[PDB]
């Protein structure tokens, strides 16, 4: 051990440390500076950036031996605090740079380091700095972060006043549609919002820390578990196995379709008879620290009989493949789509037909914050779980039978969280921590490392797809045929539903009167399927939007004009036979057209012999809602202090549940003149907030926004004074009148798609957009650079533009990853950010352009649709279409790795 006397955030510290200890652990654990965020733990994400003697360093890869006596360290807590914000922190708030906020401290500390060395950077300088310092963001697409640095720099330089970093209220007092900052931004930019790992450090001494004993093969029969060496190891309390589970030890899919061949009870909590994928949790070590639990987990011995594993859909779907879940066929679900007339004769007599085989793979969510949860037995006898769940009520019912609790005896709460992008539509750690809390009686905390986040959370499910179009010479679509095979890994939850998305979205955007197709879901031993932003559309629309360009090429038609010819107009129906609710695609195409033509001309002019430029187009469409007559609930409550609490379970991945609540409520409450800072939101809690539903399917703004609207309208009615005006809280209480008022809303016009035909009216609101990608391909290396992305977006009406702009930039950036670099195929190689192709800042162009072409929705609150998944529906199709524009080669199977492009260029 050594004494080191240093200065931390301006205060001399008399530190006692191990020279080998990591600076991140010293700062977080010894000094309580949990504003130093840790994600990857491998020097790849920048979340743990600190200033050490004038240099920006990653604290997770800096050992204390590198910190000299008299060193100066700055963390986010030294940059500024809530009543004392630095210009960078104010700028982050103003520009909406904190979505989940998990990267915000590290970017802000890194940016201070930049500005202390280069006071007036160019945008390019800012991007180069964040590239060099590995500052990674999965939410924002980087552009808002660069905007904030530039604004802060201008203030620090005396070029503009610091007051201009503070939001100015619009003259009408309307925050709906404005850039009003989100309520959580200040806590995020100051490192004073505690995420799950932060909470773990601040739990009491009695808390047990868990480590998973995980399968290191993909498929096996389990013979036994020997915990004896582990029990003797330092700090070890006990080891938990399936024998300690008090219920069924299975998670239920809950809404398993009747025509699914499986019962939906296939997923274990702790493996008992079998390993179904690499990473499966077989046991939990409980210890006094994460480090001691992990060390002991390595010594737990699992005796198993390895079985042949099926590592892709086609392999598992083979007629003679062995059943992974004995008694259920590996191909456990099929969804037909049968619209209009038989397609065979139409293809036979059409002027033109095209066909393609396409593949979109096992995209990894890669939030900067790895999964984390905790649980405890309450003083009331209930089991409480605090996790990254984005569907607290959903998960309660998915896990309660398995853990052996009645629903009223379990409470799920959503912690502040550092992104999910859908993986938290699935249970991950909730049942594990519940079992351990119940077994021990003690609080328990489980933190996944980044390799566990990659290997042992769910993934986008790969689809193998064949799609065909028949058309007239003038480009009019006549018919489509489609076939898709969905590799869902071993756990069925929502896999049938995902497969149904192919019936809804392959070919969406156009009038297609005659469709015949079939989707099939297959269990495999690769990673189980969890929702990933777009949930079936990125697969579906990659196929159909690439195929539209192939059709245009075969006709000798411009691909934007081919889309214009076929795009939804009044009278048309979508693939499920439903009329669209608005018709904005022609408007968007007309507004894009001159920008597209200019981009084509630029690409021609700026191409060289070696660096070929191209432009690609695609359309995107997706529903806002869960299928059928989805619903939500909110409670609007006047508090004694005159503030209003809007109670919901709107789960915040980081997309903006807070600002969606406040902005929607503000608009609904305008007749009573309620200031936005007087409106409070509630963190999701199954005991004390209504069942607003999960934050999946780009649904909350529509469903919960409408419920908030209705609740607020009902509160206005409850407060109305006879003769005009409104009663105060005191007046209502004096009259024994209610002050907490419910509102509900249901998408009553919606119907579920039919099991035989696929037809129905599954959503009452959709999101519509048109993408343009501009790319350069180095034809010597096959490397593609995306130089610009544009999204024409119809969101109906914006609740908050900082929120929607950010959602779109983030989705576009994930689209660039999906197109060019990302996968989770190799269990070890793809288990790091860099290994799996995470997009760092230079991969994302500074030119991300949005044009709102908003057509108010009949059923949306104040006309709003959702936004969340729109920007990931098909940006990757536009990008691949741009590669084809540039070079003549079409990549059919994502991602477009350089060697793959090269092989195609040279063929």
Nearer to a copy of itself, 333 or 683 (CB): 683
Nearer to ligand FES, 712 or 841 (CB): 841
- Which option in ligand PCD, ligand FES, Cl ion, none does residue 38 bind, with CB closer than 5 to 8 A by kind? ligand FES
* Angle between helical axes of 495-505 and 537-555 (0-180°, round to 10): 30
- Which option in ligand PCD, Cl ion, ligand O=Cc1ccccc1, none does residue 891 bind, with CB closer than 5 to 8 A by kind? Cl ion
Nearest to 395 by CA among 693, 51, 192: 693
Given 170, 173, 308, 378, the residue binding a copy of itself (CB under 8 A): 378
Given 48, 297, 512, 702, the residue binding ligand FES (CB under 6 A): 48
H helix count then E strand count, the chain: 25, 30
User: Min. distance of Cβ 663 from ligand FES in angstroms?
Assistant: 19
Tell me whether residue 799 is annotated as binding: no
User: Min. distance of Cβ 5 from ligand PCD in angstroms?
Assistant: 22
Q: Residue 563 has which token pair?
A: 């889309």
**Cβ contact 140:107 at 8 Å:** no
The answer to whether residue 255 forms part of the interface with ligand O=Cc1ccccc1 (CB under 6 A) is yes
DSSP state of 639: -
The answer to whether residue 263 forms part of the interface with Mg ion (CB under 5 A) is yes
- With CB under 6 A as the contact rule, which of the stretches 239-247, 541-549, 692-700, 715-723 interacts with ligand O=Cc1ccccc1? 692-700
User: Min. distance of Cβ 682 from a copy of itself in angstroms?
Assistant: 11
Q: Where are the beta strands (DSSP E) in 402-552?
A: 410-414, 444-447, 463-471, 477-487, 514-522
- Which option in ligand FES, ligand PCD, ligand O=Cc1ccccc1, none does residue 693 bind, with CB closer than 5 to 8 A by kind? ligand O=Cc1ccccc1
* Location of structure tokens 């048309």: 572
Q: How many residues bind ligand O=Cc1ccccc1 (CB under 6 A)?
A: 14
Given 370, 490, 495, 696, the residue binding ligand O=Cc1ccccc1 (CB under 6 A): 696
DSSP state of 233: S
Tell me whether residue 137 is annotated as binding: yes
Give the C-alpha separation, 848 to 189, whole Å: 24
Q: In what order do the strands lie in the sheet with 631-638?
A: 679-681, 644-647, 631-638, 740-746
- With CB under 6 A as the contact rule, which of the stretches 92-100, 115-123, 566-574, 688-696 interacts with ligand O=Cc1ccccc1? 688-696
Tell me whether residue 281 is annotated as binding: no
The answer to whether residue 622 forms part of the interface with ligand O=Cc1ccccc1 (CB under 6 A) is no
* Location of structure tokens 């409550």: 637
Tell me whether residue 325 is annotated as binding: no
Nearest to 818 by CA among 750, 877, 892, 730: 877
Phi-psi region of 793 (alpha: psi -120 to 50; beta: other; left: phi over 0): beta
Residue 540's CB is within 10 A of a number of other CB atoms, namely: 32
Give the C-alpha separation, 677 to 167, whole Å: 13
- Which option in ligand PCD, ligand FES, Mg ion, none does residue 41 bind, with CB closer than 5 to 8 A by kind? ligand FES
Q: Residue 53 has which token pair?
A: 């003697």
Tell me whether residue 48 is annotated as binding: yes
The answer to whether residue 160 forms part of the interface with a copy of itself (CB under 8 A) is no
User: Min. distance of Cβ 358 from Cl ion in angstroms?
Assistant: 9
Given 150, 154, 199, 217, the residue binding a copy of itself (CB under 8 A): 199
Paired residues of 521 in beta bridges: 333, 486
Tell me whether residue 653 is annotated as binding: yes
DSSP state of 354: E
Tell me which of 298, 869, 899, 903 is the catalytic residue: 869
User: Min. distance of Cβ 696 from ligand O=Cc1ccccc1 in angstroms?
Assistant: 3
Given 377, 600, 732, 904, the residue binding a copy of itself (CB under 8 A): 377
The answer to whether residue 394 forms part of the interface with ligand O=Cc1ccccc1 (CB under 6 A) is yes
- Which option in Cl ion, a copy of itself, ligand O=Cc1ccccc1, none does residue 425 bind, with CB closer than 5 to 8 A by kind? ligand O=Cc1ccccc1
Give the C-alpha separation, 903 to 118, whole Å: 43
- Which option in Cl ion, ligand O=Cc1ccccc1, ligand PCD, none does residue 892 bind, with CB closer than 5 to 8 A by kind? Cl ion
Burial zone of 125 (CB within 10 Å; 0-12 exposed, 13-18 middle, 19+ buried): middle
- With CB under 8 A as the contact rule, which of the stretches 132-140, 379-387, 461-469, 815-823 interacts with a copy of itself? 379-387
Give the C-alpha separation, 40 to 369, whole Å: 8
Q: How many residues bind ligand FES (CB under 6 A)?
A: 25
User: Min. distance of Cβ 616 from Cl ion in angstroms?
Assistant: 16
- Which option in a copy of itself, ligand PCD, Cl ion, none does residue 803 bind, with CB closer than 5 to 8 A by kind? ligand PCD
- Which option in Mg ion, a copy of itself, ligand PCD, none does residue 804 bind, with CB closer than 5 to 8 A by kind? ligand PCD
Tell me whether residue 40 is annotated as binding: yes
Residue 479: C-alpha distances to residues 187, 475, 583, 743, 764 (Å): 53, 12, 21, 44, 25
Burial zone of 204 (CB within 10 Å; 0-12 exposed, 13-18 middle, 19+ buried): exposed
∠45-47-50 over CA atoms, to 5°? 120
Given 265, 564, 726, 892, the residue binding Cl ion (CB under 5 A): 892
- With CB under 5 A as the contact rule, which of the stretches 30-38, 47-55, 265-273, 386-394 interacts with Mg ion? 265-273
Name, in order, each residue with C-beta under 8 angstroms of 651's C-beta and a sequence gap of 6 or more: 389, 390, 391, 392, 414, 657, 684, 694, 695, 700
The answer to whether residue 419 forms part of the interface with ligand FES (CB under 6 A) is yes
* Location of structure tokens 């409980």: 286
The answer to whether residue 108 forms part of the interface with Cl ion (CB under 5 A) is no
The answer to whether residue 50 forms part of the interface with ligand FES (CB under 6 A) is no
**Cβ contact 829:770 at 8 Å:** no
Given 139, 891, 894, 901, the residue binding Cl ion (CB under 5 A): 891
The answer to whether residue 26 forms part of the interface with a copy of itself (CB under 8 A) is yes
Given 23, 26, 40, 193, the residue binding ligand FES (CB under 6 A): 40
* Angle between helical axes of 87-95 and 143-156 (0-180°, round to 10): 140
Give the C-alpha separation, 643 to 729, whole Å: 10
Residues in the chain: 907
Q: Which of positions 271-290 make contact with a copy of itself (CB under 8 A)?
A: 288-289
Give the C-alpha separation, 480 to 543, whole Å: 12
Strands 410-414 and 383-387: parallel
Element (DSSP H or E) covering residue 109: helix 104-117
Q: Which of positions 52-71 make contact with ligand FES (CB under 6 A)?
A: 58, 60
The answer to whether residue 41 forms part of the interface with ligand FES (CB under 6 A) is yes
**Omega into 895 within 30° of 0, i.e. cis?**
yes
Burial zone of 327 (CB within 10 Å; 0-12 exposed, 13-18 middle, 19+ buried): exposed
* φ/ψ (deg, to 5) at 615: -130, 135
The answer to whether residue 535 forms part of the interface with ligand O=Cc1ccccc1 (CB under 6 A) is yes
- Which option in Cl ion, Mg ion, a copy of itself, none does residue 320 bind, with CB closer than 5 to 8 A by kind? none
Give the C-alpha separation, 313 to 315, whole Å: 5
The answer to whether residue 422 forms part of the interface with ligand O=Cc1ccccc1 (CB under 6 A) is yes
Give the C-alpha separation, 423 to 363, whole Å: 11
Nearer to ligand FES, 23 or 296 (CB): 23
Nearer to ligand O=Cc1ccccc1, 196 or 697 (CB): 697
The answer to whether residue 897 forms part of the interface with Cl ion (CB under 5 A) is yes
Would you call 869 a catalytic residue per the annotation?
yes
Interface contacts to Mg ion, rule CB under 5 A: 263, 265
Interface contacts to ligand FES, rule CB under 6 A: 38-41, 43-48, 58, 60, 98-103, 137-140, 368, 419, 654
Binding site, annotated residues for [2Fe-2S] cluster: 40, 45, 48, 60, 100, 103, 137, 139
Binding site, annotated residues for Mo-molybdopterin cytosine dinucleotide: 653, 869
Q: Name the residues annotated as catalytic.
A: 869
Binding site, annotated residues: 40, 45, 48, 60, 100, 103, 137, 139, 653, 869
């Amino acid at each position: 051990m050594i004494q080191k006397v240093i200065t931390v955030n301006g205060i001399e510290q008399n530190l006692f440390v191990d020279a080998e200890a990591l600076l991140s652990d010293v700062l977080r654990q010894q000094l309580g500076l949990t504003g130093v965020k840790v994600g990857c733990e491998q020097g790849q994400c920048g979340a743990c950036s600190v200033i050490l003697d004038g240099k920006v360093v990653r604290a997770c890869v800096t050992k204390m031996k590198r910190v000299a006596d008299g060193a100066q360290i700055t963390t986010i807590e030294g940059v500024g605090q809530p009543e004392n914000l630095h210009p960078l922190q104010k700028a982050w708030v103003l520009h909406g740079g904190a979505q989940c906020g998990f990267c915000s401290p590290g970017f802000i500390v890194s940016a201070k380091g930049l500005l202390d060395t280069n006071a007036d950077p160019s945008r390019e300088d800012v991007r180069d700095w964040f590239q060099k310092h590995r500052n990674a963001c999965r939410c924002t697409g980087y552009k808002p972060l660069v905007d904030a640095v530039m604004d802060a720099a201008a203030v620090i330089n005396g070029k503009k006043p610091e007051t201009d970093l503070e939001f100015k209220m619009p003259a009408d007092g309307r925050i709906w549609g404005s850039k009003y900052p989100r309520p959580t931004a200040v806590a995020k930019v100051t490192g004073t919002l505690d995420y799950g790992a932060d909470l773990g450090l601040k739990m009491p001494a009695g808390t047990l820390h868990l480590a998973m004993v995980q399968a290191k093969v993909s498929h096996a029969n389990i013979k036994g578990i020997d915990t004896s060496e582990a029990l003797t190891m330092p700090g070890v309390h006990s080891v938990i196995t399936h024998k300690d589970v008090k219920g069924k030890n299975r998670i239920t899919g809950l809404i398993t379709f009747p025509t699914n061949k499986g019962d939906g009870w296939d997923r274990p909590i702790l493996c008992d008879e079998k390993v179904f994928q690499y990473g499966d949790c077989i046991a939990l070590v409980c210890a006094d620290s994460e480090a001691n639990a992990r060390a002991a987990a390595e010594k737990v011995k699992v005796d198993l009989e390895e079985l042949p594993a099926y590592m892709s859909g086609p392999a598992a779907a083979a007629e003679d493949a062995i059943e992974i879940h004995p008694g259920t066929p590996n191909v456990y679900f099929e969804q037909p789509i049968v619209k209009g007339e038989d397609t065979g004769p139409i293809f036979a007599s059409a002027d033109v037909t095209v066909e393609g085989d396409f593949y979109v793979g096992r995209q990894p969510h890669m939030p900067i914050e790895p999964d984390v949860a905790f649980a405890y037995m309450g003083d009331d006898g209930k089991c409480y779980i605090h996790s990254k769940s984005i569907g607290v009520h959903l998960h309660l019912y998915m896990i309660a039978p398995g853990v052996g609790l009645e629903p009223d005896q379990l409470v799920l709460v959503a912690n502040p969280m550092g992104g999910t992008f859908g993986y938290k539509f699935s249970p991950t750690s909730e049942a594990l921590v519940a079992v351990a809390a119940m077994a021990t009686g003690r609080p328990v905390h489980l933190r996944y490392n980044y390799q566990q986040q990659q290997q042992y959370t769910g993934k986008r499910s790969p689809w193998e797809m064949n799609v065909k179009f028949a058309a007239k010479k003038d480009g009019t679509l006549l018919a489509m045929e489609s076939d898709w095979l969905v590799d869902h890994g071993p756990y069925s939850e929502f896999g049938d539903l995902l497969t149904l998305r192919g019936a809804q979205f392959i070919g969406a955007g156009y009038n297609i009167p005659n469709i015949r197709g079939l989707g099939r879901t297959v269990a495999t031993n690769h990673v189980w399927g969890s929702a990933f932003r777009g949930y079936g559309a990125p697969q579906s629309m990659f196929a159909s939007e690439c195929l539209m360009d192939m059709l245009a090429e075969k006709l000798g038609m411009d691909p934007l004009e081919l889309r214009y010819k076929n795009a939804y107009r009044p009278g048309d129906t979508n693939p499920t036979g439903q009329e669209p609710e608005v018709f904005s695609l022609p408007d968007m195409i007309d507004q894009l057209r001159p920008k597209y033509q200019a981009a084509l001309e630029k690409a021609q002019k700026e191409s060289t012999a070696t660096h070929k430029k191209g432009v690609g187009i695609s359309i995107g469409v997706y529903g806002s809602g869960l299928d059928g007559p989805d619903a939500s609930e909110a409670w609007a409550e006047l508090n004694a202090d005159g503030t209003i609490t809007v109670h919901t379970a709107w789960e915040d991945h980081g997309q903006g549940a807070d600002i969606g609540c406040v902005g929607t409520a503000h608009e609904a409450l305008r007749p009573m003149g309620v200031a936005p800072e007087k409106i409070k939101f509630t963190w999701p809690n199954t005991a004390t907030t209504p069942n607003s539903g999960p934050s999946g399917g780009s649904r909350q703004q529509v469903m919960t926004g409408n419920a908030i609207r209705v609740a607020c309208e009902n509160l206005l009615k409850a407060c109305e004074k006879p003769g005009g005006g409104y009663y105060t809280y005191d007046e209502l209480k004096a009259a024994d009148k209610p002050t907490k008022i419910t509102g509900n809303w249901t998408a009553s016009g919606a119907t579920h798609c039919d099991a035989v035909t696929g037809l129905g009216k599954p959503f009452v609101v959709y999101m519509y957009g048109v993408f343009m990608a501009e790319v350069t391909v180095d034809v010597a290396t096959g490397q593609t650079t995306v130089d610009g992305m544009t999204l024409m977006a119809d969101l109906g009406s914006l609740c908050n533009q900082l929120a929607t702009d950010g959602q779109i930039y983030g989705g576009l950036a994930q689209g660039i990853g999906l197109a060019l670099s990302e996968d989770f195929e190799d269990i070890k190689k793809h288990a790091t950010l860099v290994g799996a192709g995470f997009p760092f800042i230079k991969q994302i162009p500074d030119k991300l352009d949005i044009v709102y072409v908003n057509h108010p929705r009949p059923d949306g609150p104040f006309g709003a649709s959702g936004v969340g998944e729109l920007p990931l529906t098909s940006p990757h199709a536009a990008i691949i279409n741009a590669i084809k524009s540039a070079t003549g080669v079409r990549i059919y199977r994502l991602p477009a790795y350089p060697e793959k492009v090269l092989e195609a260029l040279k063929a």
